[PDB]
Design a protein around this ligand. Structure first.
Ligand SMILES: [Ca+2]
Ligand SMILES: [Ca+2]
Ligand SMILES: [Ca+2]
Ligand SMILES: [Ca+2]
Ligand SMILES: [Ca+2]
Length: 453
């Protein structure tokens, strides 16, 4: 058996696992399976400069044969829409190798896009065509007394997501499946928790973004969307290859990645081209569960299944909030700051920098490889009597034999201290080989009682 602390960690790094099992009776699809699913039409924009350069035009006047569409009264895009449309395009252009330049159909471009608003409710809230049809690149939006959604698009609302949705469609992605309901979906993760393309809400899959009466929709391409658009046009590695901070104190320069308040509802998927990165959810007071695993999910800002790191992305640091959080790292050096409260931190691979912050924080180790002597973890703010080092994942509650020197017997551990630099160190002999095979260094005293194993 392990401790409760560990289980919470193991369970959360498995809570969102996809593939090879049934969920709600429907098969579970790994992102790759969903990237296939979402691009099953074979429709796409063509290229051999290895990049797609699309141009677009907010239509000023109705095109030839416009009246025969039955959409009623043609209207031009407002400044608000144009401004939101541009953020949407951009959000797509960041993850995949595609660019959208405002301008008329050119001789040297890979296709042209057009945005316009109609008035007759017969048309539908909005629609777009696939990149291989005759009306390719177009997308129309309904706007009348009875339907005001597309009137004021802004971060968080469906008016904006509708733009991210329609653009994804014109780019080549299709709705997850073909009065239908989520019962009729081909797979489990067919919710707007995984794709902006889905017709179903996060509650079908268990996630919780908002309560009754309020709306919440991710402005930018979610998890599956990025994989699918990247499958089509390749990942854009040059975007944010610098040192990006996401969430609070963000340096992402994107509205959907920005938080400045405790009430903020963040629903996003992190895409980044390199550098050393941080997910800072420090401004939050609710219990969070941040997972730094590529393609994994987090429960952020009082919500659940709302944040994720895109498949094939490395995010090195996490900053929880003042709640009892959980921080799960990757195989890389991680600076994991619990921030404040009673949280559990899991470094994982490599030598991590762990900060428990105030409160009685737990640092958990599941492998000997997590904290080896030749590349060990460091708990900078270790407070004895309150904090605790969990090794139950490795010892299974078999205990350790605290000694001053290694006796070549397995389970022999040594708590050392160096007052003249406030530093302790937990050393262990899991193999009983006579020497250390696990080491954790602290700043602040670590007592033998502060160990759980
Ligand atoms: Ca970066
Ligand atoms: Ca804390
Ligand atoms: Ca915390
Ligand atoms: Ca790590
Ligand atoms: Ca580690």
């Amino acid at each position: 058996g392990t401790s409760s602390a560990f289980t919470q960690i193991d369970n959360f790094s498995h809570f969102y696992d996809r593939g090879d099992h049934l969920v709600n009776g429907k098969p579970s699809f790994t992102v790759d399976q969903v990237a296939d699913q979402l691009t099953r039409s074979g429709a796409s924009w063509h290229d051999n400069d290895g990049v797609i350069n699309l141009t677009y035009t907010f239509l000023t006047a109705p095109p030839v044969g416009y009246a025969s569409r039955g959409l009623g009264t043609f209207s031009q895009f407002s400044a608000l829409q144009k401004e939101q449309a541009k953020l949407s395009l951009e959000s797509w252009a960041d993850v995949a190798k595609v660019t959208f330049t405002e301008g008329p159909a050119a001789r040297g471009d890979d296709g042209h896009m057009t945005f316009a608003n109609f008035s007759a409710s017969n048309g539908g809230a909005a629609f777009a065509y696939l990149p291989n049809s005759s009306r390719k690149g177009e997308s129309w939006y309904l706007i009348n007394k009875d339907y005001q959604v597309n009137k004021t698009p802004g971060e968080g609302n469906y008016g904006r997501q509708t733009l991210t949705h329609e653009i994804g469609h014109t780019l080549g992605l299709s709705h997850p499946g073909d009065n239908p309901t989520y019962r009729d979906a081909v797979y489990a993760e067919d919710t707007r928790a995984y794709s902006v393309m889905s017709y179903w809400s996060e509650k079908n899959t268990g996630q919780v973004f908002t309560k009754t009466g309020e709306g919440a929709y991710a402005s930018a391409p979610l998890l599956d969307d990025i994989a699918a658009v990247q499958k089509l046009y390749g990942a854009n590695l040059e975007t944010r290859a610098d040192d990006t901070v996401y969430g609070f104190n963000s340096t992402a320069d994107r509205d959907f990645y920005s938080a400045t308040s405790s009430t903020d509802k963040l629903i996003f998927s992190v895409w980044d081209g390199g550098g050393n990165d941080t997910l800072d959810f420090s401004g939050f007071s609710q219990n969070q569960k941040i997972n730094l695993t590529a393609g994994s999910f987090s429960d952020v800002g009082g919500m659940t299944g709302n944040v994720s790191i895109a498949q094939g992305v490395t995010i090195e640091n996490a900053i929880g909030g003042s709640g009892n959080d959980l921080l799960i790292g990757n195989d890389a050096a991680n600076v994991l700051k619990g921030g404040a409260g009673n949280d559990i931190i899991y470094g994982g691979g490599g030598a991590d920098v762990l900060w428990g912050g105030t409160g009685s924080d737990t640092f958990v180790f599941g492998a000997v490889s997590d904290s080896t002597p030749k590349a060990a973890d460091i708990i900078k703010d270790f407070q004895s009597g309150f904090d605790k080092i969990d090794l139950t994942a490795i010892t299974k509650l078999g205990g350790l034999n605290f000694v001053d020197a290694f006796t070549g017997h397995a389970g022999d551990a040594i708590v050392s201290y160096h007052q003249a630099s406030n530093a302790g160190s937990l050393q262990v002999d899991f193999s009983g080989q006579g020497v250390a095979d696990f080491l954790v260094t602290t700043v602040g005293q670590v007592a033998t009682y502060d160990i759980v194993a």
